[PDB]
Write a protein that binds this ligand. Structure first.
Ligand SMILES: C[S@@+](CC[C@H](N)C(=O)[O-])C[C@H]1O[C@@H](n2cnc3c(N)ncnc32)[C@H](O)[C@@H]1O
Ligand SMILES: C[S@@+](CC[C@H](N)C(=O)[O-])C[C@H]1O[C@@H](n2cnc3c(N)ncnc32)[C@H](O)[C@@H]1O
Lengths: 137, 146
């Protein structure tokens, strides 16, 4: 067996917490899909966590998944967004590396950034521009 | 499984009422384009400020050279093909789809299912950018109409 280890850039072992992410915009499962589309349109976000009234993360709503579900005849604009909760997305820790982040971002369009306290807490969303801006700046 | 089976069997009668409407129902934004001589770092700043994931790269006459995308910029940076001071001309992406205002929303839907965007070109002048179109443009139309 032969192994290869790449030479890593300066930022590789720096941590997700260096990016300076804001708190996420989240939605309740009971607002409509149409209302969620306006919110996401206003902000220029492709996704948001869906959280219940007790603060539990139920999953993510994404534009891709809303579009698929609409095409499949399964959701309409006036339905609750709870109907299109996407439950399989990637998580990363606030103290995980930018290297790990970069792997996730190459395969997925976002990750939910998590931090461990007495329970596992959501810190924010992270997407390619957050990493790009950091490296560029 | 069974749902895919149903959607395949009745694909024709499950086509949305708007399937054969045209992309021009969407009324898009004016496009933000860049020349190939601005840097990758400045491209990243511009796209960050607007909240766009992609822009057309055009020449001094407005002729489309291709697209710059965040995903391809990231890959190119990871592979060491460019650094931020390099011209964005070094990462012109060409494997995207162009469509016209007269193309159906159905054609657009197929494209958006696989890619993050399409480039809308001028109906009789396919070398010029009309606008960019992404999922939220189609979603916004359907929510408006329903
Ligand atoms: C403006 S959006 C542009 C589109 C991009 N594909 C996206 O969805 O992030 C990019 C910026 O918004 C942030 N962002 C995305 N979704 C978020 C949300 N639900 N809450 C707060 N920030 C979010 C990203 O972390 C990034 O800083
Ligand atoms: C604010 S962005 C949000 C993130 C989304 N993933 C994207 O890149 O379009 C969505 C809106 O910006 C528009 N848009 C995207 N790229 C653009 C560009 N280069 N010039 C003008 N509008 C653009 C889209 O057509 C859509 O109306």
């Amino acid at each position: 067996n032969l192994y290869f280890q790449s030479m890593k850039p300066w930022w590789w072992h720096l941590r997700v917490q260096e990016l300076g992410l804001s708190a996420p915009l989240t939605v309740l499962p009971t607002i409509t899909c149409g209302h969620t589309i306006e919110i996401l349109r206003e902000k220029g976000f492709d996704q948001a966590p869906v959280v219940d009234e007790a603060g539990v993360i139920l999953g993510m709503v994404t534009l891709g998944n809303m579009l698929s579900s609409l095409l499949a005849g399964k959701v309409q604009p006036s339905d609750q967004v709870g109907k299109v909760i996407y439950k399989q997305f990637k998580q990363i820790r606030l103290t995980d590396t930018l290297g790990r982040l970069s792997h996730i971002l190459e395969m997925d369009h976002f990750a939910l950034v998590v931090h461990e306290q007495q329970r596992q807490m959501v810190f924010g969303v992270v997407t390619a521009i957050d990493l790009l801006n950091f490296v560029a700046a």
